[PDB]
Amino acid sequence: DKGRGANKDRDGSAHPDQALEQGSRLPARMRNIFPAELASTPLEDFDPFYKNKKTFVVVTKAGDIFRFSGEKSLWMLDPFTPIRRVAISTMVQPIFSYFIMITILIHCIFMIMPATQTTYILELVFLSIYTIEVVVKVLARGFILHPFAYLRDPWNWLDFLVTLIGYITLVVDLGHLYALRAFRVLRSWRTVTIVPGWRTIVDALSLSITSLKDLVLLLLFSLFVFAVLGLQIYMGVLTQKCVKHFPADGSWGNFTDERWFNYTSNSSHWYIPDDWIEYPLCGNSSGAGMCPPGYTCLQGYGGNPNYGYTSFDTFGWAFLSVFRLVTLDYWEDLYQLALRSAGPWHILFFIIVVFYGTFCFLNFILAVVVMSYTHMVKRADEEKAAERECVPWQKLQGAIGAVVLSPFFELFIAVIIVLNITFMALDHHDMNIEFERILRTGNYIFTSIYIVEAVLKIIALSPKFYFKDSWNVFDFIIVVFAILELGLEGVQGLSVFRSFRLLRVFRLAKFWPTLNNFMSVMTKSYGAFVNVMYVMFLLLFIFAIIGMQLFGMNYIDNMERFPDGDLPRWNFTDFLHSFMIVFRALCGEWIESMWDCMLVGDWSCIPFFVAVFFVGNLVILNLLIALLLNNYGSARDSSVQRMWSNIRRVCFLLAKNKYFQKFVTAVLVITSVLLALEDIYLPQRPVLVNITLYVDYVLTAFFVIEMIIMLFAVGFKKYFTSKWYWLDFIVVVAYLLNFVLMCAGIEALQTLRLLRVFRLFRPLSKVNGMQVVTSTLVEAVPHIFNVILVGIFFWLVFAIMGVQLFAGKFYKCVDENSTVLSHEITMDRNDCLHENYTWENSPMNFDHVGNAYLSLLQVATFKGWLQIMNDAIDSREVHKQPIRETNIYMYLYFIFFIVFGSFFILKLFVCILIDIFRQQRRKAEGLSATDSRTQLIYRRAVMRTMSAKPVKRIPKPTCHPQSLMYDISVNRKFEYTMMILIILNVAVMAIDHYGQSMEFSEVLDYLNLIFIIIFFVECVIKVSGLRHHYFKDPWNIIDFLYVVLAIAGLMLSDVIEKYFISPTLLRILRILRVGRLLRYFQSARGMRLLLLALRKALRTLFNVSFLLFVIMFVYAVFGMEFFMHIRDAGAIDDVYNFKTFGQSIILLFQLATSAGWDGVYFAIANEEDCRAPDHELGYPGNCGSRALGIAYLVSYLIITCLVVINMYAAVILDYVLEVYEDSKEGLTDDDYDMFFEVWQQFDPEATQYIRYDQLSELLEALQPPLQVQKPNKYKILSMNIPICKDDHIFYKDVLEALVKDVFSRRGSPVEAGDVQAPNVDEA
């Protein structure tokens, strides 16, 4: 429309074309003062070959719509017929743009190899090529002085800034401005245009960045309000180290004047237990970690964890520690360092910053990327609507072909292939010679069946229709690679023909339809995946060469900063090491790589690792989700009857009462908080043991009597067929069995008492919002079970490949305590045992396929994956010492697993819950299933009309105080000038820092007395002018509660002052008043479409977390039974363990995001060097369980971390996508709330009518999309508002008329007869 008129705007004397290239075309036109036969209405081919090429380009240039041709159009802004015409003829050639693309793919190869004496002689020639296409593409057309010239499009604007870089770094600059030569890799972004279909991803990548302008400014505001809030309550907290007492009567000085400051603040008087790097923190609080005997916790005494980079004592460093907590990378080392120093009640800080930080504001980013991809795909499908619119030989062939026709012979090959995969998945390291003999002779049988079958199939069908389909030609390649295996085993040079017997696992794809339908879509949409895979590996190539040029020589120059003076295993010192350190930051991990970057260099590491996290992980990984949502969207028996049906009629009335089933709910919640008090301190609290004993006897009487009431109400048939009453019946059977055992001897089993926790799910599904949340976990439970089974299959190919590469390796010769020996000291098992050492195995290994799956879940969740990589790179042979880094190309096994098994398989769980919640919310809102795409936009505009009323304006009272306070208590000037002072009350709190001075806190305390009294005047004016209406606004009671607690802190200071007006709680209330900004701006329509989408989801995002707390309640009670006496190893210690119910929730909140389940697994599944339970004495024994530890964690990660944490993103993407479908098709919820705001400016009463005169000022004062400008009186006659008597109109009949004006002027034929048909259907 607008560009369609702009297409004709170029046509008349503005900018005439000069050439044309559409389907092998090379034309030559001019600016109609001396043109040469372009075209007007003929399609000629006679005179010019440029016209003869334009005859085939008469239909092909305008084939799809308009975009096949490209014209060097300048209208001869400088006379276009010199030799300039020849450079036009060269630039339009397809060989020219094919030549520059080749010299870029060559110049990328000379970046990844290290430099030499012939680099400067070869960096000079490629600079000479790229300066010719910038002087040809300007001397053919180009200035900055007119349209289409040369600097209009960004692609020619990428030649010019990079070629100016190449001429700066060659003249004067040798050491200064040397960082600019790193950016000559940016020219390699041109080669996106070589893969077909590049426009639907790059424009979607471009629409995503230009649509996050409204979110980054909202996320920069919420990080600011958290960096201030974390600075006030955690400054100096992270430097608390236990310092030994000053020695009584010892070898130091007498007077504790300055010798107390030389004794303390000497590094040999801090604790540092047993060869550790950092020093352990402690706290004076109650659940915080304490110090040994004879020491003490002290604050100060410099040294801050992670080289000084993990802190909260400056606004700069508090802004970084909050940002890694929104990111969730290695955040449990911050979570565990702030609960150890400040005690366990500070989990309430981390719940808020994880809820509002990474479950909301990182799922709004997912929603913008999903809506930006689906806009550029659905745009690119209108273009698909335009392209589319002898005699013994033939004897046996009936007999051999008789058996290969049936499903019986297809069953027989299907039994063998499931059996052949089993013999590949049973071999391992150190296997018996009889057990290995079976697997060799099974290979001679299974290859023999595959040869008989192929030949039989070829004879039966034909030797020329056999190669028709793709399965019979895939089968024949297997028989080729298998018949080489039986001949190349006596050669025994290389076992690479032994690798392609792993390729026959994919024979199972043609048999069972779940894996068949999964393969079918990856081939139907192969063009979508290869584009995003190429863009992702092209960004990692750009960032690898930038990182290697910037940070490369720092890792070699001053290695001395690193611990033990060695390189890290992850550094920017080579290409293959720069690639993997950028690739593991796209996987999430960037903070640990940034510490040792910034340790060895400058501040410039910080803009690098944020830009590779923001581009790599928040955009590219969310396009990769967004592909999946579009491709994977699919005697006298009547007289005994008055006794039996007499009880039956009464007992059915108990189950229907609202007081009975509220009584039974109240029992089950009281009796399970009793179950959270059975901890390790229970066998010394003698009164609590007897309470929890006689409750287990009343509960058996309560469960049997309730069961008889249900069986006398719902009957036998509907009891035992329902799924909830089977939870009832198992628990009653579980408590009859504990009563049987304890009458007759045996003490009760403590894992059958814990089954009444599973009875808290019946009253949980009756909470007001929880019916939508629990209905999508039940509807999607068969859809996850297909994705798990398809997930097990592709993981199995990587596992029975990882066994064949890594089994028998990962052994090493280790010293007394833990230190791994070196090569040239020992180099095999012979040299290790002879020197009386030990030859240990790694904990996570690849010996058999059971050990493979645990070690491969480590690298799929990215938690424990550095040690398995550090084992896989060092391994060389079965009984040799691992030399470090000697096998560096085993990284390619892990890149191909993380792509095909983390970015793709584990992101299908997000794809399911987005699909199912979108259609279960529609059922729960009462809407019609499969109504329409646009008719529901019109229903939500009528259903929001019917349920809206005006709002009473505040009645001003009449006194000399009351009239002149209310004048200033209502002004929009006064609301702003009391808001700009709240902001300056909090920006002053961001310049507090640790150990500032005494003179600096003399200004900032007196400045905190000026603002504390302006907010007292404001709180008097807004109550003197607003009698009881002040207390109705939630941002006024918080403003009221601050001035009360802050006047009580200054006056009446020393009342008792034990702890009443503690200055932490006043700091929390200064920062909390900035939240009025969320109800402040409305001119930012891009932000209010995210604040309104947020508010409509908070009720159903409180229910997703309240289901998560119940699941965390269930495993915290089972975890205190199983894993309470475990000895201290790795992550379970004296502070974070499973002893009390407090310590269990601290760990299970950490493990809900899978943060560090590798260290929790290493303790709770440890069966070596443990004592035994001597039950005839006591001592339950400090020994973990391998089998119970796997089933506890692996079931937990597939509940919280895969289908409950992924439930927040399914809710955010549903409501955000609805709100944007109301700004582009009509009437958001903030549009109605403005009509009733301008309604009370004309009707300041409880009435609902106005005067018919005032209608011309309604429709002029409000904002669009409801305005009608002047003269409006001919727009109101046709509008037909029903005038009631005495010149009064009703607000409904004006609101309905302003609805039907909007739908008419936007939706032409789809809203006239539809938006009026729906309103008649209700009224």
Binding site: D427, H428, H429, I433, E434, R501, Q804, L805, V878
Partner: protein, 57 residues
Amino acid sequence: SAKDGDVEGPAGCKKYDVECDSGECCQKQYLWYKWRPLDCRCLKSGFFSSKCVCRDV
């Protein structure tokens, strides 16, 4: 008498780290400061290829 790396068993004795076939190992060998028994295990070498060797237990 623990004189050297020495092994006790029958004739045809195959020592440690020598290829065996289904019971052609020895009873017990003094190899690394102790007397250790020996079975005929099969290790891993390359894809899907086992190489069988007398190993200690």
